[PDB]
Amino acid sequence: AKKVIVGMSGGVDSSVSAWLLQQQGYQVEGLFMKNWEEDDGEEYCTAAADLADAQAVCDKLGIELHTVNFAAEYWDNVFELFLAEYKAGRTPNPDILCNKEIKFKAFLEFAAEDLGADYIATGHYVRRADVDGKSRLLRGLDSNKDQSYFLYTLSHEQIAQSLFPVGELEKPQVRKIAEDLGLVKFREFLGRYLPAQPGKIITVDGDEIGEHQGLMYHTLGQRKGLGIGGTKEGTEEPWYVVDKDVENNILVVAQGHEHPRLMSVGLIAQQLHWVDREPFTGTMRCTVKTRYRQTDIPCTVKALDDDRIEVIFDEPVAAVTPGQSAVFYNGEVCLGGGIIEQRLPLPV
RNA sequence: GUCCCCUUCGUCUAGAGGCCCAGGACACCGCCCUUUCACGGCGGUAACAGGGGUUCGAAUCCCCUAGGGGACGC
Numbered sequence A: 001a002k003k004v005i006v007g008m009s010g011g012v013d014s015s016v017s018a019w020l021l022q023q024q025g026y027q028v029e030g031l032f033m034k035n036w037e038e039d040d041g042e043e044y045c046t047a048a049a050d051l052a053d054a055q056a057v058c059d060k061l062g063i064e065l066h067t068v069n070f071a072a073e074y075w076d077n078v079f080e081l082f083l084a085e086y087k088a089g090r091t092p093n094p095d096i097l098c099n100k101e102i103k104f105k106a107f108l109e110f111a112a113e114d115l116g117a118d119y120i121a122t123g124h125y126v127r128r129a130d131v132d133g134k135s136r137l138l139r140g141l142d143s144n145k146d147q148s149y150f151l152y153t154l155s156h157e158q159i160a161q162s163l164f165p166v167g168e169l170e171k172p173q174v175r176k177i178a179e180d181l182g183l184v185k186f187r188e189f190l191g192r193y194l195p196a197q198p199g200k201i202i203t204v205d206g207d208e209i210g211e212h213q214g215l216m217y218h219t220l221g222q223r224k225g226l227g228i229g230g231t232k233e234g235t236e237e238p239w240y241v242v243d244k245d246v247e248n249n250i251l252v253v254a255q256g257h258e259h260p261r262l263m264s265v266g267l268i269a270q271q272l273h274w275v276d277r278e279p280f281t282g283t284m285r286c287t288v289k290t291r292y293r294q295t296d297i298p299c300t301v302k303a304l305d306d307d308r309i310e311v312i313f314d315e316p317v318a319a320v321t322p323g324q325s326a327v328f329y330n331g332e333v334c335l336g337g338g339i340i341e342q343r344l345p346l347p348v
Numbered sequence B: 001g002u003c004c005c006c007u008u009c010g011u012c013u014a015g016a017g018g019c020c021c022a023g024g025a026c027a028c029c030g031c032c033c034u035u036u037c038a039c040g041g042c043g044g045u046a047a048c049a050g051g052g053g054u055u056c057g058a059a060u061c062c063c064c065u066a067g068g069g070g071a072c073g074c
Helices: A015-022 A041-061 A071-087 A094-113 A156-161 A171-180 A186-191
Strands: A003-007 A027-034 A065-069 A119-121 A127-131 A134-138 A200-203 A208-211 A239-245 A250-255 A264-274 A283-289 A297-302 A309-317 A325-330 A333-345
Touching: A003 A015, A003 A094, A015 A027, A015 A041, A015 A119, A015 A171, A027 A041, A027 A094, A041 A065, A065 A094, A071 A094, A094 A119, A094 A156, A127 A156, A134 A156, A208 A250, A309 A333
Parallel strands: A003 A027, A003 A119, A027 A065, A200 A250
Antiparallel strands: A127 A134, A134 A333, A200 A208, A239 A250, A264 A309, A264 A333, A283 A297, A283 A325, A297 A309, A325 A333
16 A cells, blocks of 8 residues: 655654655655755754654654755755856745755655655645646645745646645644644855855945945845945935846845835746646736745736746736746646746836 | 034934933844745844033033134135
8 A cells, every 4th residue: 555755854744744644544654865965063963953853753653764865966956056046146046946856856766766655745835636637736725834836846747746745734733733643144154155256236326335245145125234324315214125237246226115126017937847747828817926925916927938938917016036936826726937037127 | 724514323313401321214133934035023232522611400501622514815
């Protein structure tokens, strides 16, 4: 009877994730992946602590806890890139890669080819649904908690092999079952790799106003960091990063979480992925997410072409950041998405 | 060198003799929110240019010592 390997972080949703499967009658063993080779004694004092919790649980459930080291697949397939997008002055979402490259590939392939597994599972608050012959990626009760956003690259081929159980409950349940079952500095880090190339801050009306320490240290919409005190203008409202001039190492800023140069009408996504691996052409009426936990925003998606897509919002949106992922949903169905290449600014 | 006006938390500033062991804002620090970077919510630190005077009381009044505007310097 079906053996499913559930990766454990020593978390809680991975824990209750295993117990659920087990309770469903699966030969379920656990796997603890290690994707980074420590550098800080501060780092070890964490993984260690996860491993421990990882193990500690598996005992309580009575399942075998395995171990793999994808620390290299990681470095190459997601850390290289990760850094490379900051070089272009973009703001990448490293986790979208960690899933696509590791969690649902490295682990996926391993668990089957080695750990001899029928299915793979994980602590994602997401739901799977095989309908009309093909598996789909869904939200999972309590949309305020859905994490489908990070698994937009997956493919039915992958969805089918995976098993997302915790997504069928309301998150409150999870955290609880776990108890009733007696169970469970970014700026600095970047510096350990990227050199600071200090430039100068300028306002929307081009006015010397501050420095950088780097341009990889800011993202559109980012408030904290600048260090500005307003004067004969500013309306006192805080300052927000509105643009980044990579070529000129110029950081443009503005004022008012509602300033017109922080708003956009749409965007252009490329590096697309549609869960049903069916290429998109034409036009569609769906909804999008520019950043995690961001509320759904209705839109009109126009099949620009090939792999390029033209998304048209229904109301100007906040900080659309090129380099961030764009996920489209059709109800409970996560359809797919791509990486935001261009922002479509507000008509001047 | 002819005589008019400013000088406060990091920043821009309120105050207008006691309500000021000085307020707001932006910054910053912390916490929370969070499977990315952010946003946001909460909270917190910190200042009256120097010297005198007058007052029971001065940030608040006057007085000179320092730093920024006033159609002669022909």
